[PDB]
């Protein structure tokens, strides 16, 4: 019926087989799931606030704009082409 959500990827599902409650252990940290057109989708960051700033590797910063039920949609405050999955 419904299409695959951003959290339904094998690296994430494989982590939940080991530790059921792997998420919510570090509510301030998440992992990049996909990157496209200046928009980054992240799994985690359970305690991010709407409009808060997100820190990525290499001194790059983003802003949280879509706090969906399964993932966070963030927009980059600079160049996005250097960011990658994982």
């Amino acid at each position: 019926m419904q299409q695959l959500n951003p959290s339904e990827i094998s690296e994430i599902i494989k982590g939940r087989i080991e530790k059921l409650d792997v998420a919510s252990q570090a509510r301030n940290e998440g992992t990049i799931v996909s990157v496209s057109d200046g928009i980054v989708r992240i799994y985690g960051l359970a305690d991010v606030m709407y409009g808060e700033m997100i820190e990525f590797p290499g001194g790059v910063y983003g802003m949280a704009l879509n706090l969906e039920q399964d993932s966070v949609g963030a927009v980059v405050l600079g160049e996005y082409q250097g960011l990658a999955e994982g």
């Binding site: 299409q3 695959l4 990827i9 094998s10 690296e11 599902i13 494989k14 087989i17």
Partner: peptide, 18 residues
């Protein structure tokens, strides 16, 4: 979307763990 498109994440995760 086929059931194979949707079941792929789960079957691949179960196989890599097993």
């Amino acid at each position: 979307a086929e059931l194979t498109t949707l079941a792929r994440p789960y079957a691949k995760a179960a196989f890599e763990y097993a």
